[PDB]
């Protein structure tokens, strides 16, 4: 039991027991041990316990909490908190198990949370239509403020998945945080919306706004996923300004990457950065046929003059299903090889079609080096 | 009563009765008369009545039919046809009355039509949110193909009002025209969606597609508003290509401009077109100081050589509340006078802020003749 494991760690270190008891709000370690040893069905709120678990077992919280959450009473608030914490961490297996428990519950609020998060997950897997999710959300007769919030906030992820940034923005304008009571759920939702708006701002080349939202997410959250994508976003906002500061933010994201997917995203960010600034690149991915990491490897080859290998990778990519943004990068690299302006023109057209107001400067800058009118280039960028 | 009015026109002219019988789809005049003598409560299908009324009393069509539609049996097909005809003509009062009659009907299909059109009108009046309309449409028990079509098509209007052209597109991908039988309803829906698709094509600056959608709408509609705006769209797409073809489209739109607003739009379009191609045409005088009329006045002065009076009009407009698009035109004309590239840059920026991918050609064309790089200018236009 997680309860006894917390006490056993604290009994071996008096200062650790005192600081963790103080973090949970206790002056005496005995009341703290009683709190953490509360039977799972009798737990009232997860917030403090989640703080203790994250402080004590940072590398094993998914497993311990995977066992702990499944013992909560599905009819009560702790289980709903558990589904939100599980989903924000992207613990999909646990999240779906908890969703089943919440749906099979006798309590209407738990059933409502289970149905809304079930719709959220079906949208994540593209197993339901967005309008079908709106209608099904209408059939749930959503009563609680939280779910009234989340049944709308969840739409932002799908709109992001289809690149409908406008409908993201409008959706976020309907989110009234004042309708939410203070506590764990409201802070979690705050971190979510902070990250979403951070990526919205970065996509519009509003760097200060993106940094604001990212920093606020870091300040309100200790969830590894949130902080990882926050430092990833900050570093992304620094790509064309300062190599050392961008790299420093990226590296700050390292301690928050807990799976190889986020690790390869971070390595890819540093690989793109060092390719951009022609710095020492330790992050070339040689064990991937992912479109983006193949693109980054071809970029590295181009910088090192290995044009045949880069052109081989790009030839393989031409038969892959690259989306329009990936095609903007793709024709940027083809232009780096060919030095033909039409490739930079096509790169620009694909960055425009993907509504990317940030990385479109890649070909533009290259057009600027080749002696293009800087005013015309500035008109193209917007 | 509309029945006797038709017979009175045909009473003394057997040839008129024969061509009206042909127009209504009857081989023999006596079938036409039996149709026209049908009591409103006994009407099953509007058939050729709409063509007859439009041909005999085009200038009273709204009034007469308003008394006629309200006497129809709400349980029958001609009532649903009537709600569509009234709404596509934008006879809002009549439309809402028919919607009340359809909702209070005892026929399941009529109730469904009344509910769907009620949601559509609530969306027109901004009395319901888009997601609320999606949900309530989920509650409307929609079974008929037509309404299954219209419940989706009506969303395209709402998405158009918020400038969400992507969702528009996706929504139009869900329309099953094959589920609609031939007849008035399918023709009307085709005109609706064709105009909407024309708006999508204009937003993406797809001129050929815009023209083809406009032609489809023309082929499926005899409503003056739809045909007028379709020909206006065609002429607008032909402005920078062929003077004679654009003018031919506008002139075709002349016969459908029955209210002074449309007529003023068309005269302004012809004047603008002659100004673009620097052809001497005589000014149609209106009693207005609206922004676009004064802008046309300054343009005509610029082309006629009266540069000082054009500067006077532009000085007058500088104190007026010019829109961002209108500011694009404004600084375009100021560029024509000043020959300063900065005026054309401001015009470009205001056309981009107003999301105008078409008339942004005005400063671009001027920058091109001043020796600007053409491909860069093409990149500015997208």
From Swiss-Prot, chains A, B:
GO annotation, biological process: latency-replication decision
Matching SUPFAM superfamilies, A to Z?
A: TPR-like
Q: Which InterPro entries match?
A: AimR-like (IPR047705), TPR-like_helical_dom_sf (IPR011990)
Q: What happens when the gene is disrupted?
A: Knockdown results in decreased AimX transcription and increased lysogeny.
Does Transcription regulation appear among the keywords?
A: yes
UniProt entry keywords in alphabetical sequence: Activator, Latency-replication decision, Transcription, Transcription regulation
What Gene3D superfamilies has UniProt attached to this entry?
A: Tetratricopeptide repeat domain
Q: How does it assemble?
A: Homodimer. Interacts with the viral arbitrium peptide, this interaction changes the oligomeric state of AimR from an active dimer to an inactive monomer leading to lysogeny.
Provide the function of this protein. Answer: Transcriptional regulator which is part of the latency-replication switch system that decides at the onset of infection whether to replicate and lyse the host or to lysogenize (latency) and keep the host viable. Activates the transcription of the aimX locus. Transcriptional activation of aimX seems to lead to the productive viral replication (lytic cycle), aimX possibly acting as a regulatory non-coding RNA.
Which named protein is this? Answer: AimR transcriptional regulator
Recall the taxonomic lineage recorded for the source organism. Viruses, Duplodnaviria, Heunggongvirae, Uroviricota, Caudoviricetes
Give the gene that encodes this protein: aimR
């Amino acid at each position: 039991k997680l309860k006894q494991m917390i006490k056993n760690e604290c009994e071996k270190d008096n200062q650790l027991a005192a600081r963790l008891a103080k973090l949970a709000g206790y002056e005496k370690v005995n009341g703290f041990y009683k709190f953490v040893n509360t039977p799972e069905k009798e737990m009232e709120n997860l917030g403090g316990l989640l703080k203790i678990v994250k402080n004590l077992f940072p590398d094993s919280e998914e497993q311990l909490l995977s066992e702990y959450f499944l013992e909560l009473d599905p009819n009560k608030k702790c289980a709903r908190q558990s589904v939100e914490y599980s989903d924000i961490n992207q613990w999909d297996t646990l999240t779906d198990k908890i969703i089943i428990n919440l749906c099979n519950s006798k309590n209407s609020t738990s059933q409502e949370w289970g149905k809304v998060y079930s719709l959220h997950r079906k949208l994540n897997k593209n197993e339901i239509s967005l309008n079908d999710a709106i209608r099904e959300s209408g059939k749930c007769k959503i009563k609680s403020a939280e779910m009234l919030f989340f049944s709308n906030a969840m739409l932002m992820y799908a709109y992001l998945n289809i690149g409908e940034f406008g409908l993201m923005k409008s959706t976020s304008k309907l989110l009234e945080f004042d309708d939410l009571p203070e506590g764990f759920i409201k802070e979690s939702f705050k971190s979510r919306v902070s990250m979403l708006e951070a990526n919205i701002s970065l996509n519009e080349n509003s760097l200060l706004e993106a940094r604001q939202h990212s920093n606020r997410a870091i300040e309100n959250s200790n969830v590894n996923r949130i902080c990882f994508f926050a430092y990833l976003t900050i570093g992304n906002t620094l790509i064309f300004e300062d190599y050392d500061e961008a790299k420093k933010a990226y590296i700050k994201g390292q301690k928050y990457a807990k799976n190889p997917v986020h690790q390869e995203m971070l390595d890819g960010a540093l690989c793109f950065l060092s390719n951009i600034w022609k710095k020492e690149n330790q992050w070339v991915n040689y064990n991937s046929d992912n479109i983006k990491y193949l693109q980054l490897r071809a970029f590295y080859y181009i910088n090192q003059g290995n044009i045949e290998e880069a052109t081989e990778i790009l030839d393989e990519l031409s038969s892959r299903d690259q989306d329009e943004n990936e095609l903007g990068f793709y024709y940027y690299y083809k232009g780096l090889i060919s030095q033909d302006k039409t490739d930079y023109y096509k790169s620009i057209r694909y960055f425009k079609k993907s509504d990317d107001k940030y990385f479109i400067q890649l070909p533009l800058l290259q057009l600027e080096r080749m002696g293009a009118d800087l005013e015309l280039l500035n008109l193209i960028s917007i």
